[PDB]
Design a binder for this molecule. Structure first.
Ligand SMILES: NC(=O)c1ccc[n+]([C@@H]2O[C@H](COP(=O)([O-])OP(=O)(O)OC[C@H]3O[C@@H](n4cnc5c(N)ncnc54)[C@H](O)[C@@H]3O)[C@@H](O)[C@H]2O)c1
Ligand SMILES: NC(=O)c1ccc[n+]([C@@H]2O[C@H](COP(=O)([O-])OP(=O)(O)OC[C@H]3O[C@@H](n4cnc5c(N)ncnc54)[C@H](O)[C@@H]3O)[C@@H](O)[C@H]2O)c1
Lengths: 338, 333
């Protein structure tokens, strides 16, 4: 008897993307998960290789396999093309961006072992809309817009409560700025209160985003599930990554009804690109989320325990964790504890 | 000289009581002209921002203001924002500085200033609409070359006046190319005119990760309205909480000194509130009106009261009360 082979799309990305994905696929091959990799290009590399930021072959590959493991993609700051991360999240309607932040041993984080939260970030609307961005002809006045829908808010908050119930956690906190941004953030919060009604055993808390960031750096232990809109969830999940030892230890799963793309929270880290310093643990923790999603919880747990045990033994840790190791050294250290 | 005093909402009254007690004990020579804004003015005369309040601030050019409540969702738009727009107080100056015995999760090396654009960005009433059927909502942000230029100039001029060495412009110009993009291009052009000051650019999410890992790297942070709101609340947390975070609304012709924190309705009226934030705001005010010696005496007294653990509010782990804490600070003036 063999296990079923499962094909996943693999996007190797830009900057540190290629080195951490080589490390990650090494560790997943050592796991013996029965995965076959179908490589696709997106963003910068896709544009130069196929003349298209998001090639039809990449869309067809993700549509067929319904699962991708993805390295970070660069999007240029200011003058240039629009985010292919956002474009893929919109195209596959991956509306739930699920970002757990959990204390690990022997990191450089300033916080003790009490952090254990999940950010559920709305992933398709809010302030991350390419449309409505305009600069006046004389370069004097720029406008940008945000859009929040009843349907979008409903499905993200229902995701957060269903996650609370499936995981046995007790509190969902809806994070907003509805005092100032009454239309969009306001609609999100009214829908969040309507949805909370249907899960009476789960504590529902509301909180303004600035207070939330202050509370996160003073008593991050109070938080369980945080549900919020696209931009706020972006800022909050990067802050929570800081609480548990930095971007090297923070995964983010983009979940939709028919498809899922698993990645790290972090970007392409151009300052260290190609120097073998990057921590591959964020992408490996995303691959662990992927393993839970595709029905291999025992292998997901095994990868997580291997990572924890490797940090516990301080074995071949990258510089971001206060080690002198390298990406592939760190990967081999984790592979050897499987 | 006369300053406009707005006693405000929730904890506003108790902390303003404590603050004015300490300013008297300091002998700053201030006369207090009381005005209402927000809920109190609304209740009394049916106007959130009465012409008498606008005339008080226009005349004195200096206000000391407690927190004003803004309803969450449907209801009036912020009277804090309304006064910042009306008086064009474009520079919101929020220093975040480590204090002793301060119950912060952090080291003792935080020393930075957030310079937050205070009149535009995403804090715009106009453009907020909901569809007839209640299904779709939209909101807008506006950024101008003029507004971006004046706030980045303020950041670089503040670096020179303070001896500080680095300005970091925080943005999301990768995703929000029009508004955040225009702010970032204006920041690069202004940096050009201050060649001895280090200029750094940093995306806002990276910046929040950096703030919780090594806040010591930051000197002056300059950013747009909403980002500066989030970042300055995160930095307050870095240095012991909202009890210790002042915020000055500075414009050319007027200035409003306040705490970063809101009306704190969960503790309002219980004498629990920490008055230090508003008192550090009053020290920014003393520096602004030409009383630097008295500003420094007030800061030293607050530092020495924290070092002594004398009558601290529960947010700093004490069991002292608002007035007690102010009296303890007054005692060391
Ligand atoms: N989902 C995505 O693909 C994604 C996410 C965030 C940013 N980006 C893109 O990445 C580019 C650069 O963004 P940025 O500089 O603001 O943030 P970044 O996430 O790429 O890096 C910020 C800091 O964290 C460090 N860092 C990140 N990941 C690390 C790792 N695995 N190991 C060690 N250190 C790590 C970097 O060296 C850097 O100093 C931008 O063009 C942005 O559009 C993409
Ligand atoms: N400039 C201002 O006047 C201002 C600023 C922020 C919020 N607000 C308004 O305040 C209201 C409440 O907002 P919020 O609850 O999100 O934020 P908040 O700042 O009022 O409260 C945050 C938390 O910090 C605590 N806290 C705040 N100030 C404190 C102090 N001085 N000492 C001890 N503990 C303190 C509170 O008890 C609360 O738990 C809202 O209506 C909002 O619109 C006004």
């Amino acid at each position: 008897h063999h296990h079923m082979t499962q094909t996943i799309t693999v996007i190797r990305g830009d900057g540190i993307g290629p080195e951490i994905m080589d490390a990650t696929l090494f560790v997943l091959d050592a796991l013996q998960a029965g995965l076959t990799y179908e490589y696709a290009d997106a963003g910068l590399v896709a544009l130069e290789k196929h003349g298209d930021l998001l090639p039809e072959s990449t869309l067809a590959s993700i549509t067929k396999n319904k699962v991708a493991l993805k390295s970070p993609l660069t999007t240029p700051v200011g003058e240039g093309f629009s985010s292919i991360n956002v474009a893929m999240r919109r195209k596959f309607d991956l509306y739930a961006n699920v970002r757990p932040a959990k204390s690990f041993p022997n990191t450089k984080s300033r916080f003790a072992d009490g952090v254990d939260l999940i950010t559920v970030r709305e992933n398709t609307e809010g302030a991350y809309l390419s449309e409505g961005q305009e600069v006046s002809a004389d370069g004097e006045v720029a406008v940008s817009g945000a859009r929040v829908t009843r349907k979008g808010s409903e499905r993200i908050v229902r995701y957060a409560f269903d996650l609370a119930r499936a995981t046995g956690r007790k509190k969902v906190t809806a994070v907003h700025k509805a005092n100032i941004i009454k239309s969009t953030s306001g609609l999100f919060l009214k829908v969040a209160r309507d949805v909370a009604t249907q899960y009476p055993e789960i504590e529902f808390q509301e909180m303004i985003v600035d207070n939330t960031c202050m509370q996160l750096v003073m008593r991050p232990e109070q938080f369980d599930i945080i549900v919020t809109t696209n931009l706020f969830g972006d800022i909050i999940s990067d802050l929570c990554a800081g609480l548990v030892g930095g971007l090297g230890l923070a995964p983010g799963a983009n979940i939709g009804v028919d498809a899922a793309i698993f990645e790290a929270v972090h970007g392409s880290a151009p300052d260290i690109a190609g120097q073998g310093k990057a921590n591959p643990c964020a992408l490996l923790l995303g691959a662990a989320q992927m393993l839970d999603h595709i029905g291999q919880p025992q292998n997901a747990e095994r990868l997580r325990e291997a990572i924890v045990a490797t940090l516990e033994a301080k074995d071949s840790l990258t510089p971001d964790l206060g080690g002198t190791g390298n990406t592939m050294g760190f990967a081999k250290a984790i592979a050897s504890r499987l």
